[PDB]
Design a protein around this ligand. Structure first.
Ligand SMILES: *[C@@H]1O[C@H](CO)[C@@H](O[C@@H]2O[C@H](CO)[C@@H](O[C@@H]3O[C@H](CO)[C@@H](O)[C@H](O)[C@@H]3O)[C@H](O)[C@H]2NC(C)=O)[C@H](O)[C@H]1NC(C)=O
Ligand SMILES: *[C@@H]1O[C@H](CO)[C@@H](O[C@@H]2O[C@H](CO)[C@@H](O[C@@H]3O[C@H](CO)[C@@H](O)[C@H](O)[C@@H]3O)[C@H](O)[C@H]2NC(C)=O)[C@H](O)[C@H]1NC(C)=O
Ligand SMILES: *[C@@H]1O[C@H](CO)[C@@H](O[C@@H]2O[C@H](CO)[C@@H](O[C@@H]3O[C@H](CO)[C@@H](O)[C@H](O)[C@@H]3O)[C@H](O)[C@H]2NC(C)=O)[C@H](O)[C@H]1NC(C)=O
Ligand SMILES: *[C@@H]1O[C@H](CO)[C@@H](O[C@@H]2O[C@H](CO)[C@@H](O[C@@H]3O[C@H](CO)[C@@H](O)[C@H](O)[C@@H]3O)[C@H](O)[C@H]2NC(C)=O)[C@H](O)[C@H]1NC(C)=O
Ligand SMILES: *[C@H]1O[C@H](CO)[C@@H](O[C@@H]2O[C@H](CO)[C@@H](O[C@@H]3O[C@H](CO)[C@@H](O)[C@H](O)[C@@H]3O)[C@H](O)[C@H]2NC(C)=O)[C@H](O)[C@H]1NC(C)=O
Ligand SMILES: *[C@@H]1O[C@H](CO)[C@@H](O[C@@H]2O[C@H](CO)[C@@H](O)[C@H](O)[C@H]2NC(C)=O)[C@H](O)[C@H]1NC(C)=O
Ligand SMILES: *[C@@H]1O[C@H](CO)[C@@H](O[C@@H]2O[C@H](CO)[C@@H](O)[C@H](O)[C@H]2NC(C)=O)[C@H](O)[C@H]1NC(C)=O
Ligand SMILES: *[C@@H]1O[C@H](CO)[C@@H](O)[C@H](O)[C@H]1NC(C)=O
Ligand SMILES: *[C@@H]1O[C@H](CO)[C@@H](O)[C@H](O)[C@H]1NC(C)=O
Ligand SMILES: [Cs+]
Lengths: 179, 98, 98, 194
């Protein structure tokens, strides 16, 4: 299974270790390093109907967790979503002769623990190449559009969108082609 | 003598040879910008240590390849972590080369 | 079985002290017209992979090791002289933020 | 069998031989040469690799230039004996060029700041000593520049600085770079006026 940790690290998280016997003494193991969390009657509990409830900050270090009295392993996943900006280079004034090579960079800057999906729009031989850029609490993503020898039909609006799962920012630029 | 003993020990321990390292999967090239790997790293042996001249670098002279299976999280969370099989280089011999 | 190995990958790649070869000259910002023999020493340093980003494997306690090696200073003014230097030897690590 | 520790200086010239002075008492002694690390053992092949007892062990430097230390070893009747450990030291000396920046046309008003870079480019395993000459009474700051990779060079910088010059600072400025066996220099005329 999978357990998603969010930015609110005090906010609690629920591992769905469902129970058959509502009177079952369940502990939560996390690794690595190995830790075991017992219900203290307050913050940390196990409802059998819900599962094991624990403050996410206690297990956000861990690769995996599981209920034990063992349940199925759950994969821990800290995820960010915040996208700062999406920027085109070149950003404007783009003007090509027919047969000239178009190269468009789309750079997305994001907070940590973010994964980016790029989506482009363009007029109706376009190659895309996505990759990670090194870095400063940020991540940097690059998507490069390439047209090897353009034609009149390539004139129009080019839009690059970046998606993190919960947020999408985009940018655009008009490309002119002449002959 | 006693000083010579340890110095020889420092050389021996720091020589060019295969060593266990933790390799970050994603950074090992060609990873889709929308993927997280779980675990992020795999244990393999890589050539490392110190050569006694400069411009000379500890490199692998023969490599085995290991199939390893881990999980890949994609974005958006359309599906759950899926199992992926990937081959990583496992250096089996090293030499200080220029 | 399918999950046996994955757990093994995590275990082997966790934040912990590991034997590395440390380049003496660089560790202390030593001018490179000054040669250390051996150039490197074996110590343990915190390394491995954390499961979140912006979480970095760091040392939470350090011992210090006296080691003795030789120092040449080029252009040859003298032969190699023995020098005693203390290097950090990390003894415990934790994934911490920054 | 051999007459605390020694040193072997290697040219890194991939064909010149080097001599480890493992002197012998018995000119008829079977001597091998051990190097580490990794561990290697070199036996006299009667040609390139030999042992003269009067000179010592003779071997092509390229065979042991990887090593931290080397030593002679002989066996006599089921028991082997070693010489003193020798520390291996690959030194270089070749200086390609020494270049001033700015190199010419330097002209300052009295009170202006003079900054002169001296860059020396050398082969690997080289250490550089800088020496300047200038008109009579200047801060010097030497350092290493990153260079490679695969580029087979080292880069050294020495920066001369005069914080507010005077008429007396007009003259020839010479930067010399020494590796121990070789010295190249460059110079430039600095003019000053009121
Ligand atoms: C030393 O180990 C390195 C890896 O640590 C070896 O380099 C690797 O060489 C192989 C060819 O045998 C390269 O294969 C690659 O395949 C991919 C497609 O799967 C292709 O995109 C590449 O063009 C290439 O053909 C591999 O890239 C390369 N690894 C890297 C990333 O450098 C090397 O063979 C070893 N050397 C010796 C002497 O053992
Ligand atoms: C990944 O790289 C490591 C390091 O290069 C490889 O480890 C080596 O594995 C071989 C077995 O294939 C070991 O060979 C054995 O040596 C022992 C004595 O050392 C001997 O008793 C056996 O008969 C055999 O020759 C070798 O020791 C071992 N080296 C170590 C411990 O680092 C490994 O082979 C690589 N992985 C794969 C799957 O190739
Ligand atoms: C974790 O290990 C690191 C070493 O890898 C420890 O940091 C080091 O701590 C020492 C003393 O606290 C520092 O020595 C200092 O050197 C600087 C000059 O570089 C000087 O200004 C100081 O007076 C002192 O001599 C050393 O620099 C520092 N290493 C660094 C900064 O990378 C650290 O103490 C260990 N932490 C724990 C909690 O175990
Ligand atoms: C620098 O740090 C390293 C790593 O922390 C130190 O190596 C450690 O040495 C201790 C003391 O022998 C080892 O503790 C032992 O643990 C075993 C269980 O495996 C236990 O049965 C023994 O009774 C003992 O307590 C420990 O294994 C070892 N740590 C690691 C991670 O390898 C060492 O003290 C330092 N290096 C030097 C040269 O001082
Ligand atoms: C595409 O859209 C992005 C947002 O997703 C545009 O954002 C640009 O952001 C920069 C940096 O904040 C702005 O620069 C500005 O500089 C001056 C300094 O006084 C001031 O106006 C602001 O403080 C700001 O920092 C920039 O104005 C803003 N967009 C524009 C129109 O330039 C990005 O520029 C867009 N790319 C395009 C359409 O070329
Ligand atoms: C898009 O990004 C790539 C990667 O940063 C750029 O590729 C570089 O282009 C510069 C200038 O032409 C070269 O000096 C580099 O060697 C290139 N690096 C690589 C990896 O190819 C490219 O320039 C960018 N495109 C635009 C128009 O911004
Ligand atoms: C001093 O500096 C000048 C460069 O400023 C070097 O001049 C070069 O000399 C070689 C032949 O010796 C010529 O092929 C180059 O074209 C010269 N460069 C210029 C710009 O004139 C000179 O080599 C330097 N002196 C030393 C000893 O390195
Ligand atoms: C190197 O020099 C020797 C003479 O000392 C020569 O005989 C030999 O041919 C050279 N090495 C090569 C490339 O064969
Ligand atoms: C001096 O050298 C440094 C490093 O190469 C450089 O940053 C600086 O611009 C140089 N100054 C001059 C006058 O060339
Ligand atoms: Cs050096």
């Amino acid at each position: 299974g999978v357990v998603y940790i969010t930015e609110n690290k005090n906010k609690t998280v629920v591992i769905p270790c469902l129970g058959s016997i509502s009177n079952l003494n369940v502990s939560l193991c996390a690794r690595y390093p190995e830790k075991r969390f017992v219900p203290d009657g307050n913050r940390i509990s196990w409802d059998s109907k819900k599962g094991f409830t624990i403050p996410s900050y206690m297990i956000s270090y861990a690769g995996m967790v599981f209920c034990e009295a063992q349940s199925i392993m759950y994969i821990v996943v800290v995820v960010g979503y915040r996208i700062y900006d999406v920027v085109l280079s070149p950003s404007h004034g783009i003007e090509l002769s027919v047969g000239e090579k178009l190269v468009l960079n789309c750079t997305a800057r994001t907070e940590l623990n973010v994964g980016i999906d790029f989506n482009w729009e363009y007029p109706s031989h376009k190659k895309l190449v996505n990759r990670d850029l090194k870095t400063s609490e940020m991540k940097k993503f690059l998507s490069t559009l390439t047209i090897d020898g353009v034609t009149r039909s390539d004139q129009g609006l080019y839009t690059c969108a970046a998606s993190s799962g919960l947020m999408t920012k985009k940018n655009s630029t008009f490309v002119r082609v002449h002959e | 003598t006693e000083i010579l003993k340890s110095i020889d020990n420092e050389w021996r321990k720091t020589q060019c040879m295969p060593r266990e390292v933790a390799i970050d999967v994603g950074k090992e090239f060609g990873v889709a910008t929308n993927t997280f790997f779980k675990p992020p790293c795999v244990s393999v042996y890589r050539c490392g240590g110190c050569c006694n001249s400069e411009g000379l670098q500890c490199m692998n002279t023969s490599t085995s390849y290991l199939s390893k299976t881990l999980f890949e999280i994609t974005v958006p969370l359309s599906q759950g972590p899926k199992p992926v099989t990937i081959s990583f280089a496992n250096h089996t011999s090293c030499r200080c080369m220029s």
